[PDB]
Structure formats: C-alpha cells, structure tokens
C-alpha cells in the first residue's frame, strides 16, 4: 500500500448479519459490485468486488455474500476463511438481531483472528429504533467501533468501508477522494432525523461513564 507500482490492493471482505438486516441491499448499492458480480459454487457465496477511490488509491473490497445461508442458520467456516476484513450488521429495530451479533462475532473470531471487525447498526431509516446507544454495549466490550448505516436510504454507505480501509492501512488520515457509482436509494433519509441520531450518539459518547451502560 505504502509502496507504489504494486497491483491494485484487494481485501476479502466478509459481511455478516441476519436476514432482514438489509446487508445484501448495502452491496446492491455499489454499481461496480453488481456489474462485476461473481459467484463461487464451492462456498455457495456471491462475490462482489467493491472499489473505493482513496488518497492511497483505488482499494477493491472483495465482498462475500452468502447465498441465503444466514437464513438457513450458522455459516460454514469456508465463508469466514480468509476474512481479511469483517463487517457485522444488526437491524436497529430487531433486538434479536442485536443479540445475534455476538454469536456471529464468535464464529468469525473462531475462524479468523487479528482481523479488523466493523460493527454497524442498519435500517435506522425506521424511526422505531429499539436498539439504542445505551443498549449498544457489545461494541465497547469488544473494543469494536459502532457505525450507524441505513442501506435502504444509502445512509452512511462509505463510512464502514472508509474506516475499515483506515484500519487495514493503518492510516487515520485516509480519505475517499472519489466515490464509486452508486444505485439510487430506495428512500431518502430525513436530514433532521439523521442529525438527531448523530447528536444523540455524540452525547452518549460524551457521557462520563466507563461504558454506554453500567451493565456490569
């Protein structure tokens, strides 16, 4: 990455979540990933190359999307294997899905170790966000950053990717210089709601407690 003249850098990205998280929708947003869509029969997993143009240069994230396996149940180790990158998403409305996050994390860690993990809450587009910053504690407990994204609205699409890339490179000052072509959002996020959400998160972070909640 720091060296130049190297072939374009690809990171194998593993996306983990429950059905109804919109995780696949998140992928659908990235036009190039759709255009270059590949499938692996052996794993039963779709491959979607997602290219993001950074200050360092274009970074391809080879996104692995299980073909419905999550709906079936737990994921085969092969899917997790070689998870250079990991993003786990939970439905903000679904407490059950939040409860599932630790489980998915456990499987991921079991297969692969020393790998950056990005934890995101999805579908914030729904006003009834049952899982809130105060309830969000697992992230702190694992020392993994929380990200607020809404695939349906294409809210914060770049955020998880940019931070993931920053982790991988080790470059805090990394910026997405250019944005890859994205399919139109299903809905438009209300700016006021988004601002409120962000402010609330900031206040929670500002709050002088060892964790989001004194759960322990």
Return contacts of 142-145, CB within 8 angstroms, 24+ apart. Answer: 142/105, 142/117, 144/117, 144/118, 144/119, 145/118, 145/119
The CA distance from 141 to 125, in Å, is 26
**H or E stretch including 201?**
helix 191-206
Query: Which two three-digit tokens encode residue 117?
Result: 């993990």
The CA distance from 181 to 25, in Å, is 15
The CA distance from 151 to 28, in Å, is 9
Query: Which two three-digit tokens encode residue 158?
Result: 């770049």
Experimental method: NMR
Residue 88 CB neighbour total at 10 angstroms: 24
Specify binding-site residues for GTP. 18-25, 36-42, 68, 122-125, 150-152
The contacts of residue 5 (CB under 8 Å, 6+ apart) are none
Q: Does domain 1-216 have CATH number 2.60.40.10?
A: no
**H or E stretch including 148?**
strand 146-148
Exposed (0-12), middle (13-18) or buried (19+): which is 80, by Cβ within 10 Å?
Answer: buried
Specify binding-site residues. 18-25, 36-42, 68, 122-125, 150-152
Provide the sign of the torsion angle of the four alpha carbons 177, 188, 193, 214, taken in this order. negative
The CA distance from 52 to 39, in Å, is 21
Closest by Cα among 76, 108, 102, 73 to 90: 102
């Amino acid at each position: 990455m720091a060296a130049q003249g190297e072939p374009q850098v690809q990171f194998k990205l593993v996306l983990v979540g429950d059905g109804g998280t919109g995780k696949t929708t998140f992928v659908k947003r990235h036009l190039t990933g759709e255009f270059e869509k590949k499938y692996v029969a052996t794993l039963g997993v779709e491959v979607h190359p997602l290219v993001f143009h950074t200050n360092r240069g274009p970074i391809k994230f080879n996104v692995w999307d299980t073909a419905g396996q999550e709906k079936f149940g737990g994921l085969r180790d092969g899917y997790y294997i070689q998870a250079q990158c990991a993003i786990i998403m939970f439905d903000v409305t679904s407490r059950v899905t939040y409860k599932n996050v630790p489980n998915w994390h456990r499987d991921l860690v079991r297969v692969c170790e020393n790998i950056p993990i990005v934890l995101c809450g999805n579908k914030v587009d729904i006003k009834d966000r049952k899982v809130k910053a105060k309830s969000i504690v697992f992230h702190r407990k694992k020392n993994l950053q929380y990200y607020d994204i809404s695939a349906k609205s294409n809210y914060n699409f770049e955020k998880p990717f940019l931070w993931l890339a920053r982790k991988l490179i080790g470059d805090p000052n990394l910026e997405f210089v250019a944005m890859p072509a994205l399919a139109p959002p299903e809905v438009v996020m209300d700016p006021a709601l988004a601002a409120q959400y962000e402010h609330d998160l900031e206040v929670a972070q500002t709050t002088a407690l060892p964790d989001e909640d004194d759960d322990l």
